[PDB]
Amino acid sequence: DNSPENSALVIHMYDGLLQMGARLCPTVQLEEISNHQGLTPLKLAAKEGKIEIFRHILQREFSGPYQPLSRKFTEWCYGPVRVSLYDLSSVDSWEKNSVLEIIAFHCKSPNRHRMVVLEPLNKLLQEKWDRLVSRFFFNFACYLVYMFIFTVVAYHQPFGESMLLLGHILILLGGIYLLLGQLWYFWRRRLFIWISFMDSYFEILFLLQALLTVLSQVLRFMETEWYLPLLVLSLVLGWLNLL
Amino acid sequence: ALMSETVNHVADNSWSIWKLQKAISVLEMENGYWWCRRKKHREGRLLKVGTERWCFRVEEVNWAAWEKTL
Amino acid sequence: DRDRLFSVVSRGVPEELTGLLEYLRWNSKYLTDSAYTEGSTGKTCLMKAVLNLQDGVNACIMPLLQIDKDSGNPKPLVNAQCIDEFYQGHSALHIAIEKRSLQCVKLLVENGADVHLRACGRFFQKHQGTCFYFGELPLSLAACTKQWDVVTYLLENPHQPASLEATDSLGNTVLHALVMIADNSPENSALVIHMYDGLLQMGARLCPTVQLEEISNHQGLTPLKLAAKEGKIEIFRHILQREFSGPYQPLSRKFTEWCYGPVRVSLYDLSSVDSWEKNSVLEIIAFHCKSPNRHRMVVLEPLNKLLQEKWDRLVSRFFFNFACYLVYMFIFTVVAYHQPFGESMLLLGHILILLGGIYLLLGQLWYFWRRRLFIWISFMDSYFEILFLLQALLTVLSQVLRFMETEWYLPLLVLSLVLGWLNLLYYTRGFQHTGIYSVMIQKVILRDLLRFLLVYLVFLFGFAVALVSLSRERSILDASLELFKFTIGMGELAFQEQLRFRGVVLLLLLAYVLLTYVLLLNMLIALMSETVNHVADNSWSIWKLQKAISVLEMENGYWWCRRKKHREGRLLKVGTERWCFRVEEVNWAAWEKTL
């Protein structure tokens, strides 16, 4: 538990047991053994919310004969510039069910936001974000274009008839695509989504907007007089979801 | 009440939340679209020989630590 | 590659190798030279001989001690590693200096090492891998690494004495390199200050006829100006007010005396003077400074009182300009109002406004000509200079459009009038009580509000389009004024009677009103959250910087009359010959410290 004395006790005991296990049995990976839930001590520490032992395990280094039992290797290279190498068993979706996914999704503790700025994870996530900003902006531009087209079609709705039909069918395809994407997302993440909802409330607003759009578009074919209110509600919800 | 919530504790307790949101977003994006499963990136491979394991390399200029040793 | 076996051998017993190398060499001795081409991909054997790092002496009987015997190509001047190898551009002397091996440096310099050998290749690694810009000279590398003995041996070397005034490719000297590597940390600041003082004293001792600190690099900067421009403050402050007591007294900038009892009077040397001898410290701080620390360097000690005196000497011109602008605005307002003996007065007013507008436009163009594209340094503090230009341009364009008798004269004239009336707010630079809050609230507004109007306008347009699309079965898209009436107080929220889908319209209006109230609440709370109680002294500095910019602009004089440069606080006299600024202060703790 996150207390000054217990953290020191558990760190000391962990290091001593690891060293003695290396001495007595140098041919077994103690830290690679997994329990019934399919977790290692590092993953278990990440999931349970413990941060002190998690941080110590993440960046521990040994200097003497126990050097192989280390995760951070430090050297001085060229004068007063220190270069350090961190072992990567907390890698991203590759070899899935890793530390990053566990922190992001399966973590009930309110301390999950404090474990993403430790040292390896912060720079790794910064690099990943810098590598994928282009896709984010491309998706933003595509959504803006779709919203503009839908607004134009809604306004011009009473050669023109063909354009209106093309706009309506394009909106139908866009709505069903968004609905199917949200359903796929909710299929990937099971009822475990009950972990929290203060940070994933847009994923249901998008689903609601897509469902309303699809329902209005399919209701138009029956020529019901309730098409306009549902279409307008879908338009305003999609415009609000841009935030 | 909304003013009373501002206890001046979000100086670093709000930046962490933004970092977590960015992490969730990048995790969602790198998984790829449903109609096209994107190939997993090999990240910072740097296999090499550590004293054989993939590693992530970070450099920093430190003067106090350097001046500590002679 | 096995052929590189000759690169590394068992040191201490080079009998057969040396015997076969010098002379003879079967067919010809030139093969030995080729051994330096095939030794590695750019690294010679001497580099590895230094890098062995054995106990005590690194290479015991170093092969170089006999290599110079069979030398036909200058080997002590090793060709620095080329291409990209994360260690390119390093010579044997650089490697010896790095490992803090004074003995290796001595043996290399005894055999005729080439001092002043710029690191040819290191500037590749400066951008490829580890930057560590140290000065590209062995002396600079020794000084920046805190090795006093190596520097001492290199300078007063009987064989090859290093020159303290030597320069690298960029034009930097050892002092420039020390300034450049400095960063605002407690340890590095002390290290660089100590090294700077020691090097200055040793340069005075060895060469008392050269001004080391007066040497300028390619950019045309001195160590003081370089420190001011790069944003370093600790070394800048130390250089600005350093004093020496012993025989090194002339190498000082602050002279302190007690005068009459417990009142201490101090004289500061003035090489950071104003526009006189232009390209000085004040101009560099005011204009050419990308760092956000520029506002913290105007309250150090000489600069603060100098700027205070300059402002006190030029408040009259500021108020005269304010009065003239107010008179012009009043005349323009009167002419605009009275515009439909009277015809002559109206024509005189119109032509006077034309002259005023062209004068303001030409003044702004002159200002933008004096400050080139370098104005890209910042814009959070110089946004009035474009508003004035816009207002002058609009006024001139409207006045010239009047002569063609176009019917668009009135809107442009009214826009010019309102812009000129709004531009009057710039003159709140004085009146400290207003300005301290005004500068910081301006920064906050410019940073925050620019990301409100976009999203609010987007939501308003979306809701308006939805309402006009629903109500067609509010008649046009331009009828979005209802939402603005709602956000200002009006709106007439009521049933539409004839519209059958009245419930949907009511729900949309409710959603819009709650959304906009929530957004404005968010902005309010964010603006409050900005107030972290850190502007207690971080906002007064901004006001001082604005006053400094204003006085720099004013003292330059008008474009049509170049004002003569003021001789400032001359006080030439005799300092132990240099212009000085005198400041007095009553101190009791310092006086009571001595007896």
Numbering used by the authors:
A (entry chain D): 258 to 415, 429 to 513
B (entry chain D): 643 to 693, 701 to 719
C (entry chain C): 76 to 415, 429 to 561, 591 to 693, 701 to 719
What does the report in the manuscript say about this coordinate set?
TRPV2 is a ligand-operated temperature sensor with poorly defined pharmacology. Here, we combine calcium imaging and patch-clamp electrophysiology with cryo-electron microscopy (cryo-EM) to explore how TRPV2 activity is modulated by the phytocannabinoid Δ9-tetrahydrocannabiorcol (C16) and by probenecid. As expected from the previous studies, the channel architecture displays the classical domain-swapped homotetrameric assembly of TRP channels. Each subunit harbors a transmembrane domain of six transmembrane segments (S1–S6) with S1–S4 forming a separate voltage sensing-like domain, while S5-S6 and the intervening pore helix (PH) form the pore domain that lines the ion-conducting pathway.
As expected, the two structures obtained in the presence of C16 displayed relatively open configurations compared to TRPV2apo-1, in agreement with a functional response to the ligand. Although the binding for probenecid remains elusive, C16 associates within the vanilloid pocket. We tentatively assigned this density to C16 because of the associated structural changes in the channel pore region, and because of the lack of a similar density in other maps of available TRPV2 structures. However, the size and shape of the density does not completely match C16, which may relate to the limited resolution and the C16 occupancy. Indeed, the density is also compatible with an alternative C16 pose in the binding site. Consistent with C16 binding, residues H521 and Y525 that line the C16 pocket rotate considerably between TRPV2apo-1 and our two structures to provide space for the compound. Interestingly, the proposed binding site for PLG28 is close to the C16 binding site, but without the H521 and Y525 movements. Notably, no indication of a ligand at the CBD site is present in our structures obtained from C16-treated sample. The putative C16 binding is at a different position than that proposed for CBD in TRPV2CBD, which however is a closed structure and retains a lipid in the vanilloid pocket. Finally, an important observation from the comparisons of the structures determined is that C16 affects TRPV2 beyond the local binding pocket, and thereby significantly increasing the pore width along the conduction pathway (and see below).
